[PDB]
């Protein structure tokens, strides 16, 4: 007891936070949104938080039996 | 070593322990064509017999050969360790033998028979013409019997 201590700490803009933006999609879809609305919104907001670029992939299955994926990018990224 | 000589002395081929033994081989190995005398056994027996291993089967006195046999079939007496022996702890009289020559065939027969007679898996396995030491039998030995 007392040899361990927790503090919270707001994060300087969730906008450049992969983890935050993923959790945000999770919530958008889970909260019964649209697909492109959710994604394009996350993206437009990440961009708006002044990012160099960003990309959101949704893979799996929506409403139709067969699985599909979708890339939603804007701005600029490097890959290698 | 040395340029040697002799005369009619050495006779090629000579017969001990109910088998035959070629002359003109380096004696230690001659003794090997007998059953139950691996290179080690032969080596130690010859050393115990007080023989010059540099000799062929070739030379060797009759006497010498006699001693060689005596020790070969009475190892424990002429201080040979007993861990050096192919049949320690019989399984009936429990003595230690170094079974030799035409008799090792018998002893194999004997043991295999004991296993079969007692119905032990090893025995059954032998009787069946299979491998007994637990090796996989799918792939190996198919040329076989």
């Amino acid at each position: 007891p007392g040899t361990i201590v927790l503090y919270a700490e707001r994060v300087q803009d969730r906008g450049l936070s992969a983890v935050a933006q993923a959790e945000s999609m999770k919530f958008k879809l889970l909260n019964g949104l649209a697909i492109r609305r959710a994604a394009y919104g996350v993206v437009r907001y990440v961009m708006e938080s002044g990012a160099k670029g960003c990309e959101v992939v949704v893979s799996g299955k929506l409403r139709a039996a067969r699985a599909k994926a979708m890339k939603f990018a804007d701005g600029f990224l490097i890959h290698s | 070593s040395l340029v040697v000589q002799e005369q009619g002395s050495f006779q090629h081929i000579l017969r001990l322990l109910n088998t035959n033994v070629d002359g003109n081989i380096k004696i230690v190995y001659a003794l090997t064509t007998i059953k139950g005398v691996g290179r080690r056994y032969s080596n130690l027996v010859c050393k115990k017999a007080d023989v010059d291993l540099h000799k062929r089967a070739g030379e060797l006195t009759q006497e010498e050969l006699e001693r060689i046999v005596q020790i070969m079939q009475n190892p424990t007496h002429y201080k040979i360790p007993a861990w050096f022996l192919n049949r320690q702890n019989d399984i009936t009289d429990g003595k230690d033998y170094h079974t030799l020559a035409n008799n090792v065939e018998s002893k194999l027969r004997d043991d295999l028979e004991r296993l079969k007679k007692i119905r032990a898996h090893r025995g059954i396995r032998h009787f069946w013409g299979l491998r007994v030491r637990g090796q996989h039998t799918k792939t190996t030995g198919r040329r076989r019997a």
Binding site: - | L2, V3, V4, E6, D22, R56
Partner: protein, 70 residues
């Protein structure tokens, strides 16, 4: 088996009167002269050097080499 494992007195003398002209003598050459196998032929190598003919010009295991005396 096919022979050359003893000494047959005639063989010894044979070794003494046949070993000139052998510009090359070795383990192999002695065997090649239809006699002594690489056991006793090695002894022959040691014992022609007892005194005479063979002049030691090379050294070791496998390879030996000698030339006619002068």
């Amino acid at each position: 088996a096919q022979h050359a494992v003893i000494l047959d007195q005639e063989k010894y003398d044979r070794i003494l009167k046949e070993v000139p002209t052998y510009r090359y003598v070795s383990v192999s050459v002695l065997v090649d002269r239809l006699k002594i196998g690489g056991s006793l032929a090695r002894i022959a190598l040691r014992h022609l050097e007892k005194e005479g003919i063979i002049k030691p010009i090379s050294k070791h295991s496998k390879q030996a080499i000698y030339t006619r005396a002068t």
